[PDB]
Design a protein around this nucleic acid. Structure first.
Lengths: 84, 137, 113, 49, 177, 61
RNA sequence: CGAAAGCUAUUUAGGUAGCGCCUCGGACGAAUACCAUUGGGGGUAGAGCACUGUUUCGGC
RNA sequence: CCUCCUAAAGAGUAACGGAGGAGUACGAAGGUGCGCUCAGAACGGUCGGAAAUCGUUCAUAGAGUAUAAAGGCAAAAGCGCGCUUAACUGCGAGACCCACAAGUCGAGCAGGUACGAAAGUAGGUCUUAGUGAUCCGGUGGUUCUGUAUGGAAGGGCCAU
RNA sequence: GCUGACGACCAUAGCACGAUGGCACCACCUGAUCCCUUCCCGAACUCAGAAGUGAAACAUCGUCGCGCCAAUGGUAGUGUGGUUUCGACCAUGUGAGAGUAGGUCAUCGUCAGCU
């Protein structure tokens, strides 16, 4: 085993997947309660027609069509539900 | 033997060496460069041998710039060890060289004794090289 | 400082915009007090009342009594414009004194909030 | 944190269950909780779980 | 507040003419006087802090607020939110009365007094001085005293330049040099 | 000013007896004798010093 | 007609089970695929030093 | 079990691949109403310094966030104060994820409540770890059953 | 023509520098009785007011010093089909980032007030 360099640095752990991301995209029909984004923190913010869960999940508060925008002075990404 | 003073991480993924040196393909500080026409890994030992052989030939009347720094750790597995059971330990450091990169620059010396030192250095390097002038565009 | 006052008004402003109701914004200065009703979209003024109105321009403005008159007058203007249910927006001013007097006058003279 | 029982003082036998640190809260806790057996908020006192 | 009356009567105008200010509202004025009694020996005896609070109450005429540590420092053995000082802010007539007392009755009672250096301005027209022995103030009495302690007096003025600040302080008869 | 939290703070008549110059001001000091002024009588505090008073050799032998 | 050598779990690892994939029957009937135009979100290839680090030379 | 990367810009994706955390804490560190803004650097100032507390001037966060990392955070989610128990009961349209068993988010409705002048907000905590099926046995409730009948024992249902 | 409120938008809107503004409005400003404030403080908040000033702030105007925006061309990468010396190359579709020329001292809406 010459040089004995078989040094154990043991780290083989990992967590289970969380399946975050955008669930419904822009221009799709949506019904109230439908989850739009799963995320950690507010990568997307809730605009009109969408609510925000304790997990930062974004969901449709009412029926319509999903719309993505960048609005406000923080240049934040917003998800809205337009009545259409 | 160049080496980073300290690193964020001990070990690195192999990666790929692809593409041309669009950055670092210009004689920037000196008047005379040795640039690589081929790609590969430049070991810190190779950099040290080439620097020694340029310094001896220019004899403290000229200035050298080493444009390559070995910041990629290369792990190695010792002999008589099976596959697996964790990534090997770091044994040496390389710089990734693309075709076109300047490795050495010289300034403050005659063209002839700069070309001699650069040819001497090229002899110790794992690259096909060429000697380049400083243009302005 | 107006900057600090607008910093501390934005929470209520955004919550009212989420609620999507007509909002009764107040704005008082050491000289005058203003009250205007904004549409749920937030960019239309549909009723207003200030101490710059000729009825109470040449009088004791900048006063709790003037605030009471302004609230009483904007309640009538809102009633005549069809508004009955608003959300009050103290606009970072403390709910007290002149702002409170305006709100109590508007709340007692027809507007319910 | 030890598990404790918060029991209704209405005598309905209803209880909530919770945990507490018996070193930063050595006295028995008591809170006004909703009792579904009488549909009212009443005092619930800590008991042994 | 004889100093308030006198400043609004004649000091303001003469400062304006002496500084050559165009606008009457450009004249410097004193906005606040802060008394600080930072006792770093607190949180290890818990007697010095109350003594300093009593002495500050006697001096300023206001109830002082006990200032607590904003950080932990191992060298000073200080932890988060430990009471390590006292401060009182004086404004209006209270500040003007304190200034009159400090100018007329307190500063002359400083042992070996040669004047306060004029380069002790911060550069924004704010002055600061340090009183080594608090018994300079007649309010605190030498007989029933706990121990000798000092104090910081910061005069925060409306001035924007060091020259304006020093002119304002000279207007009140402050002992410079 | 919050009530009943601040100390006693009343009139006082400091008097530099050296230069014989008075100083009427508010202070918390409790004096012993109440000397009268032009208006009325306030607690009187005598002062030793105040702002009105406080400021080769070969040939000799 | 026509797979699979996958996922999940397992005293499991060359066994077994649910799901996936095969077949047969029924229901349903374009809800499917391809392409054109079009509405989205992204942080990869490339790139770059604005952050975290790392590197060289000069000035200071 | 959680976080990052490998992971090829939707999700997922292996290795005895590279790195780190968890098996808790909190009746306030939860709810609400109101209020506030950090780290640093320089200048001035008693002890007092590189750095204590005080004052000033710049300072979009170079801080903080109970704790690892990532993502987020000014309407602050960061920091205070008053009152409090929504860390509620019955549920839940609709989705996410998913072999199953599980897991996750959730407007709205009813009843009771807290805070707010109010519109309101509140079914724990910035979120993502802090976990263990069934069987068996214990405990608090309950009329459901009760081996001739009335009981009871035992069983069931709800909570633990 | 200007001021204020609330928005759209979120740097071509910002920063900096200079200039103009007090009849309205706004801001400083005066006082702290009263309501209400301060773990101290009328600083902030709050009230009652107009002796004073546009000094600060704010608003407006000007400019390119910074910032920000930004081509065209080229290059890199890349889907599909082919080839390869494994670097790449060809056909076709696509096409950055950086940099350069250049641009920018915003543009709109509702309501009220003075002229």
């Amino acid at each position: 085993a010459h040089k004995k360099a078989a040094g154990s640095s043991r780290n083989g752990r990992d967590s289970n997947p969380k399946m975050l991301g955008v669930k419904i995209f822009g221009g799709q029909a949506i019904v109230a309660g439908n989850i739009i984004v799963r995320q950690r923190g507010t990568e997307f913010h809730a605009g009109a027609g969408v609510g925000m869960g304790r997990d930062h999940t974004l969901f449709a508060l009412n029926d319509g069509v999903v719309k993505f925008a960048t609005k406000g002075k923080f240049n934040r990404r917003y998800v809205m539900v337009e009545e259409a | 033997m160049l080496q980073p003073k300290r690193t964020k991480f001990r070990k690195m993924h192999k990666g790929r060496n692809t593409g041309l040196a669009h950055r670092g393909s210009t004689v920037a500080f000196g008047q005379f460069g040795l640039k690589s026409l081929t790609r590969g890994r430049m070991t810190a030992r190779q950099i040290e041998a080439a620097r020694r052989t340029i310094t001896r030939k220019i004899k403290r009347g000229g200035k050298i710039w080493i444009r390559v720094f070995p910041d990629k750790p290369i792990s190695n597995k010792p002999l008589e060890v099976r596959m697996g059971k964790g990534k090997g330990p770091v044994e040496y450091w390389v710089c990734e060289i693309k075709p076109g990169k300047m490795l050495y620059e010289l300034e403050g010396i005659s063209e002839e004794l700069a070309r001699e030192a650069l040819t001497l250095a090229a002899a110790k390097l794992p690259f096909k090289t060429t000697i380049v002038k400083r243009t302005i565009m | 400082k107006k900057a600090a006052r607008l910093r501390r008004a934005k929470k209520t402003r955004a919550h009212i915009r989420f609620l999507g109701v007509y909002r009764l914004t107040v704005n008082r200065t050491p000289k005058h007090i203003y009250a205007q009703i904004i549409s749920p979209n937030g960019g239309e003024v549909i009723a207003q009342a200030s101490t710059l109105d000729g009825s109470l321009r040449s009088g004791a403005t900048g006063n709790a009594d003037a605030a009471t008159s302004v609230g009483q007058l904007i309640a009538e203007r809102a009633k005549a414009a069809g508004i009955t249910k608003v959300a009050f927006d103290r606009s970072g001013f403390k709910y007290h004194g002149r702002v409170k007097a305006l709100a109590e006058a508007a709340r007692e003279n027809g507007l319910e909030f | 944190r030890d598990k404790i029982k918060l029991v209704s003082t209405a005598g309905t036998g209803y209880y909530y269950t919770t945990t507490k640190n018996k070193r930063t809260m050595p006295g028995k806790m008591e809170m006004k909780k909703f009792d579904p057996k009488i549909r009212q908020h009443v005092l619930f006192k800590e008991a042994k779980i | 507040a004889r100093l308030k009356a006198l400043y609004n009567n004649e000091l303001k105008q003469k400062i304006k003419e002496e500084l050559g200010l165009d606008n009457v509202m450009q004249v410097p004025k004193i906005t606040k006087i802060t008394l600080n009694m930072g006792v770093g020996g607190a949180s290890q005896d818990k007697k010095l802090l109350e003594g300093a609070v009593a002495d500050m109450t006697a001096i300023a005429g206001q109830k002082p607020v006990v200032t607590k540590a904003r950080k932990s420092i191992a060298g000073f053995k200080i932890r988060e939110e430990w009471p390590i000082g006292c401060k009182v802010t004086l404004r209006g007539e209270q500040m003007y009365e304190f200034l009159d007392r400090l100018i007329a009755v307190a500063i002359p009672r400083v042992r070996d007094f040669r004047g306060f250096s004029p380069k002790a301005f911060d550069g924004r027209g704010n002055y600061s001085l340090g009183i080594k022995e608090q018994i300079v103030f007649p309010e605190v009495d030498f007989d029933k005293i706990d121990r000798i302690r000092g104090m910081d007096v910061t005069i925060t003025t409306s001035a924007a330049t060091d020259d304006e600040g020093r002119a304002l302080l000279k207007a009140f008869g402050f002992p410079f040099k | 000013m919050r009530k009943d939290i601040h100390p006693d703070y009343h009139d006082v008549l400091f008097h530099d007896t050296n230069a014989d110059v008075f100083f009427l001001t508010r202070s918390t000091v409790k004096t012993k004798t109440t000397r009268e002024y032009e208006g009325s009588e306030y607690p009187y505090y005598p002062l030793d010093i105040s702002s009105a008073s406080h400021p080769a050799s070969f040939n000799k032998r």
